[PDB]
Amino acid sequence: ALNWFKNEFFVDEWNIADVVANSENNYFTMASERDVDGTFKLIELAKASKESLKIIPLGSIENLNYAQEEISKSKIEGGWILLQNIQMSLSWVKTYLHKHVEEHEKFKMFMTCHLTGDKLPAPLLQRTDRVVYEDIPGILDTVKDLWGSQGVWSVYCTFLLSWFHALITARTRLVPHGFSKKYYFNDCDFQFASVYLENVLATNSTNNIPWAQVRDHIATIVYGGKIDEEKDLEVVAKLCAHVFCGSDNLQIVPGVRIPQPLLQQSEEEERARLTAILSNTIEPADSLSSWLQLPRESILDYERLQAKEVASSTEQLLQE
């Protein structure tokens, strides 16, 4: 019901790449909460744009001098500059960054800050384009985003890993019910699990994949390393048991089913088949209970509080 407004009226959406490409501004800033980092998105964007990204964190005067020299070099010979953690050099941000922004074509400068951190200067903030980085709330959209960033068994394992990562990152948002604490799984977890999957597939060339080994390593090392609670470790283990069971047919969600690859296709055919399955999947309205295998009354409270907060803020905004 909350998303009905933006679905029915607005027929377009903008990501970080679209904001960077479709703006006449050389200065960008990125904000996010704690335990969420979005610099890998800028790394991917600089790779896709055939640019050079210079990443300079701001904690010490040596880093500040290096940032000044690299900014001076970038204004003349192009290149992309990322300033991580600008709120830990607030005096430098208030003086040098303010002066430089106040006074090359392929030059772009990015600043990474915190939404819940110290306040940035308003004249500096108003002169740069502003984005907020956060995970995609949808599950199917998360699988599509993970799938669009990529023999046949490697493709199948990457599809299963995208599904598992989307399910666990959607489950992390339901703090009391999906887990017990607040955990943050990210592209590092996805990359480490993908490297482990490729290593298992390379070291087992007889196509007898150790699915129990894959389940236990993903549940205990790659994703269970951050977990310090036994109940949440069991939650991750049960999710791995559902996803990486290694059966002939796998119904990852009650809607769609993922058949295992045959022995007479190619990697492009497997990619096209899995993309067709992903396109033919429809996300239901009760996805947080049907797809995460949770009772409906657990997610109903969370959805009702979210909608109540959103609609109350809308009512207060409209009353003025």
Partner 1 sequence: IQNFLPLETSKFKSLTSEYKMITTRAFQLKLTIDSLKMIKSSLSTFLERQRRQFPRFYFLGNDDLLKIIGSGKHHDQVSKFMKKMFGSIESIIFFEDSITGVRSVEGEVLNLNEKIELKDSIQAQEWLNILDTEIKLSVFTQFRDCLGQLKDGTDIEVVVSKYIFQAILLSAQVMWTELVEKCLQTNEFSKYWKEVDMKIKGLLDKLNKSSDNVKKKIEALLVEYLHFNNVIGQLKNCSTKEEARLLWAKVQKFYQKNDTLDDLNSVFISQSGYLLQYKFEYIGIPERLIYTPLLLVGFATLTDSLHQKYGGCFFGPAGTGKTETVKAFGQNLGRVVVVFNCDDSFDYQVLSRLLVGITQIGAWGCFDEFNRLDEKVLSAVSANIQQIQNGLQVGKSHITLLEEETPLSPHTAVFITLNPGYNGRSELPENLKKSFREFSMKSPQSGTIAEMILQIMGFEDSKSLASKIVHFLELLSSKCSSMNHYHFGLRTLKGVLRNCSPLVSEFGEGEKTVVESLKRVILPSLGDTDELVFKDELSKIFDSNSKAIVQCLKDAGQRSGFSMSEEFLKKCMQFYYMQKTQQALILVGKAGCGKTATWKTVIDAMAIFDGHANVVYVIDTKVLTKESLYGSMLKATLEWRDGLFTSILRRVNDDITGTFKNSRIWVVFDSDLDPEYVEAMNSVLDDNKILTLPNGERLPIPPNFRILFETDNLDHTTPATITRCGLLWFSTDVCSISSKIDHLLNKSYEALFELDKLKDLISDSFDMASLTNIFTCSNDLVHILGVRTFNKLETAVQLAVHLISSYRQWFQNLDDKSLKDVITLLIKRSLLYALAGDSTGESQRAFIQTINTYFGHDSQELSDYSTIVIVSLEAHEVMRPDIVIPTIDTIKHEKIFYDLLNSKRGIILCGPPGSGKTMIMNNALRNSSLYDVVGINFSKDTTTEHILSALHRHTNYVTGLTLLPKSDIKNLVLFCDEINLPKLDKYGSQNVVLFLRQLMEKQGFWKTPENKWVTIERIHIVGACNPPTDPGRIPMSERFTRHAAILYLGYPSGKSLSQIYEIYYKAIFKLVPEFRSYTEPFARASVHLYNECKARYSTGLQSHYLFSPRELTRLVRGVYTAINTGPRQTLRSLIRLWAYEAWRIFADRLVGVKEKNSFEQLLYETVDKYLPLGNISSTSLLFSGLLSLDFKEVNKTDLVNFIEERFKTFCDEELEVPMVIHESMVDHILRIDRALKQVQGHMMLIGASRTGKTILTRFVAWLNGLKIVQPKIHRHSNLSDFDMILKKAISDCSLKESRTCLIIDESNILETAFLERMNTLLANADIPDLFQGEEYDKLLNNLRNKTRSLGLLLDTEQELYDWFVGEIAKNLHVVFTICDPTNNKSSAMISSPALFNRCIINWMGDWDTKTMSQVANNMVDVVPMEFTDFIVPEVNKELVFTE
Partner 2 sequence: KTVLLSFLEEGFVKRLENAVRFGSVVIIQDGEFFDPIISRLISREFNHAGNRVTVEIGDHEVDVSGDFKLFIHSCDPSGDIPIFLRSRVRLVHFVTNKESIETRIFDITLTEENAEMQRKREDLIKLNTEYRLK
Of the pair 57, 255, the CB lying nearest partner 1 is at 57
Check residue 220 for interaction with partner 1 (CB under 8 A).
yes
Check residue 95 for interaction with partner 2 (CB under 8 A).
yes
Output the smallest distance, CB 126 to partner 2, in A.
9
DSSP 44: H
Strands of 142-281, DSSP E: 249-250, 258-259
Q: Note whether 164 and 278 are within 8 A (CB).
A: no
Sorted by sequence, the CB contacts under 8 Å of residue 239 that are 6+ apart come out as: 164, 167, 168, 171, 219
> What's the rounded Cα separation, in Å, for the pair 311 and 301?
15
Query: In sequence order, what are the beta bridge partners of 83?
Result: 56, 111
Select the binding partner of residue 250 from partner 1, partner 2, none (C-beta < 5 to 8 A, by kind): none
Output the smallest distance, CB 103 to partner 2, in A.
9
Output the smallest distance, CB 196 to partner 1, in A.
7
As a residue count, the chain comes to 320
Of the pair 83, 274, the CB lying nearest partner 1 is at 83
Query: CA of 237: how far to CAs of 234, 260, 276, in Å?
Result: 5, 22, 29
Check residue 70 for interaction with partner 1 (CB under 8 A).
no
Of the pair 114, 271, the CB lying nearest partner 1 is at 114
Choose among 235, 133, 138: nearest CA to 180: 235
Rg (alpha carbons) of the chain, rounded to whole number: 22
Count, residues near partner 1 per rule CB under 8 A = 39
DSSP 87: G
For partner 2, the binding residue among 122, 202, 285, 317 (CB under 8 A) is 122
Stretch that binds partner 1, among 185-193, 253-261, 282-290, 305-313 (CB under 8 A): 185-193
Contact residues toward partner 2 (CB under 8 A) are 95, 98-99, 121-123
Catalog residues that contact partner 1 under the rule CB under 8 A: 34-37, 39-40, 55-60, 62-63, 84-85, 88-89, 112, 186, 188, 192, 195-196, 199-200, 203, 210, 212-213, 216-217, 220-222, 225-228
